[PDB]
């Protein structure tokens, strides 16, 4: 236990977030599979400052080298997993749904209609916290929420949509109506305007900054929300909490995506804590990597890019989350209060793409 | 008002929780299917609860029974027109059914398993027995796999009709195995397995769960699988004891939970048992991972006697969620006694015994 205790102890010099001896052991896995950094914090599931304090402490250790821009192991680095039983991590993802579940086959169409409408939108703001996820992804959430009965003659409410959620709703046709809000008015332009071009009517759409407690008009009123987060605790209330606080009471739905890319599983469990103690709802679903992300443009003004000890863009959409279901029951609520915080809504130890 | 008159109605037949919603999913079931078993699993809502609302629909002039289907009357046919309720669309992935795994490199795996386990032990009625097909068995393994959570890994298997253990010694990937079951006839059968395949590294042992495992099992395996029945009770015999058996932090364990035998309002307790008595976290929860085998005692069980049209099921109706968990700082495990007899396999959602 003694290689594997110092290597820990390293690792908690450089940060505060959780870290186990699995910790290692994933980091370890994913490096044999890959020497991409990127690749290495996806393939880990650990979240990017844990994973960057991990190689650190393995460098210095002996245990990793750098060599033309891949994180490899040394000599001493093959001995150290050898000894401890670490091998690369194998991966079984279905080749056919990427692991969403659901096959979107159905909505071709409505993905070309869509990758037609939204060529031309708004680039991600990093001052927002932005990253679209890609067309087929947001026409995967379509399919996964019709699936589940949450969409046909349903009142749907988007917290939130870089993802242009609300666009191919619209094009779906299901919705009974949409309401839809954004702090960025790029986007609740554009959808107005696809709105118009669709010829959609019931669509309401505004400005919203959500540290704000939600007006009345919003509350208990829709069926089904969805809305895709930051990550610390502060916006999962503000996002996900005022979601619920949408919601006409029990039986009514709430889709929304959490990653292991900038939340540990120590934060997962407080999150989940949040969900079923604060707010009393259950969680139907949680499946890996059903939200694929584009890569963003401000990637090297962000902490990431500034942690990482190799500096090259990523080659592949790296960045994935999970998406939850939830769904609400007898006593369950919602979020009301007002939230006093400025950047520190997107940015958390464990937060590193701003 | 319609609704709420439905509503009224179904609770006057269960104490299961009713809502709107629970009306709507049989209703859009009802549309897509008029074979009983079908409703109950498009409709995710659990057996005896779908029962009673059928009754309430067809005292109220909704439904009627034809042929041994059931059907929208007429009226049926106005109230979901009224309401906006359509039958389920379902976009499953036709090649992984929705498990997100596929175990195409374990054609060779599924092979043996098939051959080594064609005279497995029958379901018994009274474990509440019922094995997964061989292809789930092994979507199991290759699930676990990617997860690092079988790799020169100690792996507790907590009761295996579903013959995991099989596929476990076979893969070769653990470092070693423990498996319990009450049922002998498994212990038997998986130690005839063992020999069969040369497989050292395995302890086999006949346990009831309603005991604490004992002081040498605690705290020294990595990963746990279980597979349990669905009173809060048994989670807690089954999982709960699963987690005490994990080292520390960073292990794993995976377990199937219904929508056939507990509600949703179950599964908010359940997940509560989870986060706030065991401290796990819940990683995944992957929709009908699981399909069940029809097992053969279906006739003796209170299923049977609910039911208003009684046919044996014609395809496997029964499917569960895979849940992964894992430990964390402060994760713990359930070590008390359980003093029940049959309520732990019965409760009021329940209905396969
Ligand atoms: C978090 S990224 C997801 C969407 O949330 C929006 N968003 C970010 N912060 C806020 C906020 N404080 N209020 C409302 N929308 C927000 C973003 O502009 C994006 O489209
Ligand atoms: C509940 S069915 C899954 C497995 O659990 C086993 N099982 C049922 N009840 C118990 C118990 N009380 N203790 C141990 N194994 C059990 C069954 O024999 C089966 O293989
Ligand atoms: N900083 C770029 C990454 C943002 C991802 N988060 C917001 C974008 C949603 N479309 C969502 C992460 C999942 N909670
Ligand atoms: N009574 C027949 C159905 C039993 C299902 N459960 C036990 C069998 C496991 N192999 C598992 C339900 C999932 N928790
Ligand atoms: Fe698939």
Redesign the interface.
Known sequence: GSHMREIIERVKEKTTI?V????I??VL?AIQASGDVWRIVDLSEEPLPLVVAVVTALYELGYVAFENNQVILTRKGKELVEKY???P?????????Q??????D?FSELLEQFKEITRDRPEPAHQFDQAYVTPETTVARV??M??R?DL??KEVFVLGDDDLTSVALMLSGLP?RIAVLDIDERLTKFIEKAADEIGYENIEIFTFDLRKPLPDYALHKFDTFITDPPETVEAIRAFVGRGIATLKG???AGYFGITRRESS??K??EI??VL??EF?????????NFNEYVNWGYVEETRAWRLLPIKVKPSYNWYKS?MFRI?T??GSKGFEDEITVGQELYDDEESSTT
């Open positions: 959780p186990y001896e699995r910790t052991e994933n896995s039983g670490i091998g991590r194998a991966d079984y993802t279905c080749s056919h749904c692991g969403r579940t659901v096959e979107i159905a399919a996964l019709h699936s009965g046909e003659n009974k029990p039986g009514c599983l120590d997962w469990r989940q804590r079923l103690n009393g709802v259950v969680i139907t679903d949680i499946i890996r999970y769904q029951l007898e």
